[PDB]
Design a protein around this nucleic acid. Sequence first.
RNA 1: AGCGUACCAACAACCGCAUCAGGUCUCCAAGGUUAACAGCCUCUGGUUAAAUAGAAAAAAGUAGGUAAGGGAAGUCGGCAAAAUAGAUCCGUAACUUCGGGAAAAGGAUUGGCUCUGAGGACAUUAAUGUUAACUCAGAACUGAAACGGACAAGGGGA
RNA 2: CUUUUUCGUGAGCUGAGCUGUGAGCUAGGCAAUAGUUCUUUAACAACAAAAAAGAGCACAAACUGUAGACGACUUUUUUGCCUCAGGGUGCUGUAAACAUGAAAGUAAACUUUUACGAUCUGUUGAGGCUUAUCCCUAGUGGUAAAGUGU
Lengths: 97, 332, 123
Amino acid sequence: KPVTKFITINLSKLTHKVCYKRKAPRAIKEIRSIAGKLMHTKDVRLDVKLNKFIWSKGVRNPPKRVRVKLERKRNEKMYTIVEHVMVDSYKGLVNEC
Amino acid sequence: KAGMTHIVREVDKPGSKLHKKEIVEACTIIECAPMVVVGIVGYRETPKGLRILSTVWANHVSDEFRRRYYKNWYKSEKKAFTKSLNVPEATKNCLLKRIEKYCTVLRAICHTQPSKTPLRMKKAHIMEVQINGGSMKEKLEFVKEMLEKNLPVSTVFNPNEMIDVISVTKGHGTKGVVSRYGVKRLPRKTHRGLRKVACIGAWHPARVQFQIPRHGQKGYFHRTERNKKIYRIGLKTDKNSASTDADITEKKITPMGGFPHYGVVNEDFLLLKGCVAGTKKRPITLRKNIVPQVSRDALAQVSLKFIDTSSKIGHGRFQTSEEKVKYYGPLK
Amino acid sequence: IEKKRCVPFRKYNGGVGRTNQAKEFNHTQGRWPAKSCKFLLNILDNVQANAESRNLDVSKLRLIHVMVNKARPGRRRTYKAHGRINPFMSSPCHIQIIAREINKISNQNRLKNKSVKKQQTVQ
RNA sequence: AGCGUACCAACAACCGCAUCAGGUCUCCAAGGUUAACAGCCUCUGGUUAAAUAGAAAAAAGUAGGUAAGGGAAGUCGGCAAAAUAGAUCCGUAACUUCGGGAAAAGGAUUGGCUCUGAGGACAUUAAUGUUAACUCAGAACUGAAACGGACAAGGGGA
RNA sequence: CUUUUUCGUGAGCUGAGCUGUGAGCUAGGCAAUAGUUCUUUAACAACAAAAAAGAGCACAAACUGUAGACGACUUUUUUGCCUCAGGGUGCUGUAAACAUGAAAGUAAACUUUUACGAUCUGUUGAGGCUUAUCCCUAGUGGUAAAGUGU
Ligand SMILES: [Mg+2]
Ligand SMILES: [Mg+2]
Ligand SMILES: [Mg+2]
Ligand SMILES: [Mg+2]
Ligand SMILES: [Mg+2]
Ligand SMILES: [Mg+2]
Ligand SMILES: [Mg+2]
Ligand SMILES: [Mg+2]
Ligand SMILES: [Mg+2]
Ligand SMILES: [Mg+2]
Ligand SMILES: [Mg+2]
Ligand SMILES: [Mg+2]
Ligand SMILES: [Mg+2]
Ligand SMILES: [Mg+2]
Ligand SMILES: [Mg+2]
Ligand SMILES: [Mg+2]
Ligand SMILES: [Mg+2]
Ligand SMILES: [Mg+2]
């Protein structure tokens, strides 16, 4: 049924192997896969502001960590929405429901 | 296998350039949690080779011993070794009398305890250990006393003993002739590349012979190495198991920050001089010499002056974690 | 189509790679051709639709005839070095399917006398 | 009066057997750095397209980058690659058809910041007042001793 | 097949003797026939239908990386594992901001006040980073789908 979750993802762990011209698209693809795998959905939509935030430093170095909000909605009867959460410190954050 | 470190030792070779000097040497550390003895097997000699009479099991076995018989234990009914432990002891004693009368070689089945290590694996490793010594009856008596107990490693070996090592080397995949066999490298002008052998053979043996080096798999080979000497047998009941007469600092063997890629060592261990094949976590087998040696190095006994326990991540600078906080004073 | 099970390639298999999913069939080589599967599914839906008009129950149909034939190829070109031109053909085919319901001395008096005597001699 | 007037001009409209990395005549030409219409970055205008895409990442190849100590011992042969290079100030041999050789060979300097000095035009009278452009020469201070910091750019001699 | 019948050996009885089995002694009555031979259908081992009875695993998935071109191999699936975080051990070299703090010098009001200044100092062994193949923690959230062969 519908649920919300708040998680943090560190991308440097996931873009460690690809070359310069592939570093940001790889991060986008990994975010989509992770959300789909966590919510048991195949249809995962990515908000445009999050895509904007991932590309804000060019193709060569995306941010090291990102905080996102996952929401599973009732609509292939279900799907997931991924949004971006702006924080000024990642130091205490764990994942919740 | 856990990792490596170095020590300081004094020399006692009259006539050498180093006769009264402290010197540094490299050593390897092997974690040696005790084993468990669970079975007996007897062989007899035939013109077709050694042959088995029967196998005799103990009254109880553990779950990590039983996991070794399953591909996927989590989804099973776990019915291995459940009906054959209720056997009357009269049949077992009849079988043991037959083994005593007709056999010539005994071996003991023993298994390890991976739960006492930092390993992710839970299946135990099983092996046979041959027992040399007196007569057949004495051998059988010696074995039966242990059918459900632990072997400490200190029972099997002694300080300053010489030992043989058996393991599997590190794997690298497919490697070229230059790296696999160490052939010469070929001049920079060559048209199809330079990392190969020029001539495969003469014209007319009209085939390629098996002695020619070719590309293929390198690493993950089986090896047996001789003459590795024991420097210390440490225990887990001892708090200062890495201190010496000349250094009374209370210490355990594990370096600051953990053994890199392994974890912490909190069982009893061996300290071996030199190097051993395999990666970290690779299981190492330890055999006695084929015949005992009487040379000047096989009998000499070693006294240690210092064991290093500084960090192996980066470049270590302190021997214990209290020195680090004592050096800097209070921080922010 | 979704790559959960594969097709074992036993005949036209030169250079086909080895796969995990071929142990199901006692083989080593398999692949996942999706276009073939779509084309075959179209004909299977046709067969089922035709079997529902005439009053047959779909639960009992067995594929008793599957035949594949090759058809007249098409023609294109490709350009090679030193001003040459070589063919770039195609390879079409025909298919046909059938499904069907499944449930679940000589007297010779001389020889008679010999038989009688043989039978008596064995008692 | 009569005839031409659409469109391409290569990036797929032309020739090369093709929607081929080839060939094919003329005019217009911004900002910063700079000797410079060079190289590198940008505004107006144009595009984000190429007979394919995803994953994995070992041998071997092709186009590159580094390497302790030695410095051509390699090879027919220094082949290939390194080393040099802008500008200012000094200093330059044999020989010579007296014009050269010559950038011969060689040596020193170069950032940033705060200042000092030199070079014109005009109007009330030597005295007062207004008013510019760009170069050149010195001094103090400053920094992990670095400064033609990227680009661009001779190896020399008998 | 009847008659008088002795010696040995076991399903049950207890090296009493009955049964069952074998070998004999004594006197009897009662068979075989298919026109001259056509392999003398004769062995061993199976199978099927009817008649009395003994009644779990592996592959695939997700995880691992001691493995690796692909297959293959090493592991885990609820005291485990994955993810984040807190600690540890290391790498670099002192963050942003504020300061009637310093600074070769400058210029401009009426002792002092104001303005411009490369760079330096204090808060500051600070700030940033650290497994993707580093170490510890039943710390936080999760741990899905249920197919194939036998
Ligand atoms: Mg050549
Ligand atoms: Mg190290
Ligand atoms: Mg071609
Ligand atoms: Mg041509
Ligand atoms: Mg026109
Ligand atoms: Mg023509
Ligand atoms: Mg072409
Ligand atoms: Mg063209
Ligand atoms: Mg390469
Ligand atoms: Mg370098
Ligand atoms: Mg070198
Ligand atoms: Mg030479
Ligand atoms: Mg030579
Ligand atoms: Mg020559
Ligand atoms: Mg050259
Ligand atoms: Mg000259
Ligand atoms: Mg600051
Ligand atoms: Mg991990």
